[PDB]
């Protein structure tokens, strides 16, 4: 009846927006999870981002990569929302400094040259997933068109639960070797986009690690975490939103409320 309680409190908020809330939470230290709708399919937007970072890395740990190998593309048309790749066209990125734009900024054409050259697209993306055992993650389209949101479009979504369960995975787990995940759990630390939703939700002083989406139709938006807090075993959230219709905006004081609801259930 902790759950339950939680239960009812994120179906009044999806109710009072009008829309629909997918939550997976899990206290890495009791090993206590909480979930609303976790099985359910949401829209990943620019989410999976993170886990392009993360695969990234584990390229460069089975040496396929390096990652300060300059990524040079002087000639490309950059995608909208290149904010941080295109202040270094002229000169070229590392491809971690690439993979961590991609992260911590969003940033589009990072995304996008990554998947064309070392991921091996959309179907890469979704085979790295597939390899650290998600089953639910797919991603269909490349950047911009995969954040159409079109409700019952089945294309470029997941699961709260299967996010969480790999962000665990990544962020925590052994996929990635101690250096390496090291670097990773620093990409996530340092990103810029989520200081509304997940790290909103919990006290300014504890450590937070996120990936945010916000696919500006339908709603429908996102934000996954690692959280430190001090002198406790990590926590991992998983929040994703969609609403009914297509001009509604997306809703960041409803992702860190359900973050909020889905913290105090694992506790
Ligand atoms: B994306 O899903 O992630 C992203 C975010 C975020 O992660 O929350 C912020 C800014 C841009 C992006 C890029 C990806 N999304 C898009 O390209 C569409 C996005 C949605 C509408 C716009 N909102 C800014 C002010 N309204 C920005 C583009």
């Not at 009812?8 to 939550?23: A, N, Y």
């Not at 190998?69 to 491809?95: A, C, F, N, W």
Request: proline share 3%; hydrophobic share 35%.
């Amino acid at each position: 009846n902790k759950s339950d309680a939680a239960a009812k409190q994120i179906k009044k908020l999806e109710e009072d927006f009008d829309g629909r809330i997918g939550v997976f939470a899990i206290d890495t230290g009791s090993g206590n999870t909480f979930g609303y709708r976790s099985d359910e399919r949401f829209p990943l937007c620019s989410s999976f981002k993170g886990f392009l970072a993360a695969a990234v890395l584990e390229r460069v740990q089975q040496k396929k990569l390096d990652i300060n190998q300059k990524v040079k593309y002087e000639s490309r048309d950059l995608e909208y929302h290149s904010p941080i790749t295109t202040k270094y066209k002229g000169s070229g990125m590392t491809l971690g400094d690439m993979a961590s734009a991609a992260l911590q900024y969003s940033d589009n054409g990072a995304t996008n040259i990554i998947m064309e050259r070392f991921l091996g697209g959309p179907e890469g993306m979704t085979k790295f997933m597939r390899s650290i055992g998600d089953n639910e993650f797919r991603l269909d389209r490349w950047e911009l068109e995969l954040n159409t949101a079109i409700p019952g479009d089945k294309r470029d979504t997941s699961t709260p639960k299967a996010v969480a369960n790999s962000l665990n995975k990544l962020a925590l787990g052994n996929v990635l070797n101690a250096k390496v995940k090291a670097i990773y759990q620093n990409w996530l630390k340092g990103n810029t986009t989520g200081d509304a939703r997940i790290r909103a939700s919990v006290p300014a002083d504890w450590v937070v690690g996120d990936k945010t989406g916000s696919c500006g139709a339908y709603g429908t938006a996102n934000d996954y975490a690692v959280i430190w807090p001090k002198n406790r075993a990590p926590l991992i959230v998983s929040i994703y939103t969609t609403r009914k219709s297509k001009d509604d905006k997306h809703s960041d004081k409803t992702i860190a409320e359900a973050s909020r609801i889905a913290i105090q259930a694992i506790d």
